[PDB]
Amino acid sequence: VPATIPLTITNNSGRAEQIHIYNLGTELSSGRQGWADASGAFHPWPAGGNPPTPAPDASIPGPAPGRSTTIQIPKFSGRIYFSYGRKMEFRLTTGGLVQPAVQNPTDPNRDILFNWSEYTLNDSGLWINSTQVDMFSAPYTVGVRRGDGTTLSTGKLRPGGYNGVFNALRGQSGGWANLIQTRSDGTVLRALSPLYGVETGALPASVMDDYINRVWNKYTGTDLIVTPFADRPDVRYTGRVSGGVLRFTDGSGAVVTTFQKPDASSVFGCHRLLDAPVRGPISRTLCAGFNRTTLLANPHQPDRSAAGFYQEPVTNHYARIIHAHMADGKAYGFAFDDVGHHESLVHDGDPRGASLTLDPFD
């Protein structure tokens, strides 16, 4: 893999605003945090602080409507951000770049229309994604041109899919409507993922309690079988609830990890009581089963197809709705949507180039 590959950025947004691009992350060779310019040259961030202090302007001018621009991506792990009209405000803490947190009303980027793609380019190739783990906002498609010349892309919404997602969220009772952030003059900005919905009070900590209790009851009287390694189908862990705790045993008979009854943040964020650091692979499987609400219906996890996903009246509706509106049915609707390979990521080991397309607000 060469030192850089070209990323072609195309503006199909249909919008008139100028575009600002940021390539922010960590340099592979040095491990230092900073940004890369259009030529691929790396610029380490200056030292930050506690409290965090302002970052220098790392913007690169993006493509005008109907046109593309090219930047060179170096061996780097990080994010390509794009914003419409306004520049983003980034800050630097002791340890480096502060991530935006627009679930906070006071975040300096709260009112800016922006999104990002997550990528890694290293000696083993390129990984680039379309993600909705934190929010659903300005749409985009990412792609890779593989060593053999073939292309893969993902992230593309169906026609009418952008407004389709918002309309479906607004109509989902229970608090999902309060996930939507809307310029007080009505125009939609983004919808927060339900993890951040719990944080903001849009959804209650108890929203999944009825379903979770049903799962705990079921697996008090029968085994939950988890085979969490896609390439090692014979490695199985057996879960059973006793004393209110879901306990997993391995082939040898040892209890290897235990789970307390989870809450909404734990499920929607795949963390806390569902932390995934042998526990990690098991937890990741359970996380996906709770978000897709397949745990009750299928005692042999993970699921082998998506046919039974999202059928319960209370489920991760944000994820359900986004997957339904993606052209390829894939999305990063929650952190472990890669369970069963349903996530919007493309990869190649010997990439020739990559693409980011800013899509229309359709």
Domain boundaries of the chain, sorted by first residue? 1-203+316-362, 204-315
Q: Is the dihedral of CA 276, 278, 279, 285 positive or negative?
A: positive
Resolution as reported, in Å: 1.6
β 4-11/353-358 pair status: parallel
The position carrying tokens 């952008």 is: 162
Report which of 229, 220, 247 is spatially closest to residue 302, judged by C-alpha positions.
229
Contacts (Cβ under 8 Å, ≥6 apart) of 195: 134, 265, 268, 269, 334
CA atoms of 107 and 103, how far apart (whole Å): 8
CA atoms of 74 and 1, how far apart (whole Å): 10
Chain center to CA of 328: 16
Looking at the chain, how many residues does it have? 362
Experimental method, per PDB record: X-ray
CA atoms of 130 and 201, how far apart (whole Å): 26
The position carrying tokens 């990984």 is: 127
C-alpha dist (Å) from residue 27 to 74, 258, 355? 8, 38, 20
Terminal alpha carbon distance of the chain: 37
- As annotated, the active-site residues are 118, 134
Q: Enter the CATH code of domain 204-315.
A: 3.30.920.50
β 224-226/300-301 pair status: parallel
The position carrying tokens 């900590």 is: 205
- The contacts found for 241-244 with CB under 8 angstroms, 24 or more apart, are 241/216, 241/217, 244/216
The CATH superfamily label for domain 1-203+316-362 reads Thaumatin (2.60.110.10)
Contacts (Cβ under 8 Å, ≥6 apart) of 327: 156, 157, 158, 161
One-letter amino acid at 289 equals G
Q: Coil, strand or helix: which one is 200?
A: helix
CA atoms of 49 and 45, how far apart (whole Å): 12
Q: Count other C-beta atoms under 10 Å from residue 185's C-beta.
A: 5
- Got the DSSP string for 64-101? PTT-EEEEEEESEEEEEEEEESSPP--EEETTEEPPP-
Reading the block at residue 154, the tokens are: 């993902």
In which element (H, E) is residue 219 found? helix 209-221
Q: Count other C-beta atoms under 10 Å from residue 237's C-beta.
A: 23
